[PDB]
Amino acid sequence: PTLPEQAQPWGVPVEVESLLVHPGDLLQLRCRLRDDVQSINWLRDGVQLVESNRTRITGEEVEVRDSIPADSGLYACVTSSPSGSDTTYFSVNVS
Numbered sequence: 001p002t003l004p005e006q007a008q009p010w011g012v013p014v015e016v017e018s019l020l021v022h023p024g025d026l027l028q029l030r031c032r033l034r035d036d037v038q039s040i041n042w043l044r045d046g047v048q049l050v051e052s053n054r055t056r057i058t059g060e061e062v063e064v065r066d067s068i069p070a071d072s073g074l075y076a077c078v079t080s081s082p083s084g085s086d087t088t089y090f091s092v093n094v095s
Contacts, residue, residue: 020094029062
């Protein structure tokens with residue numbers, strides 16, 4: 001009842017997806033999901049984040065189809081439930 005790697009095999013201690021995107025393109029960070037976590041927070045840079053304009057942040061994956069200064073930092077994804085937390089580290093950097 002849990003999908004720990006429902007994206008790619010990139011579960012590493014404080015990393016996940018280190019990718020560079022050019023100025024005006026699509027960049028994405030896909031987390032995991034299970035009958036445990038219900039809220040997926042994408043900590044942009046180094047703190048919780050979930051915007052909209054340019055970035056369509058879904059409780060499972062965050063897709064930014066523009067990669068502006070906005071994707072200059074670490075997008076660590078924290079999937080959580082009232083009593084559990086799992087994290088993946090997507091380094092997303094704008095070129």
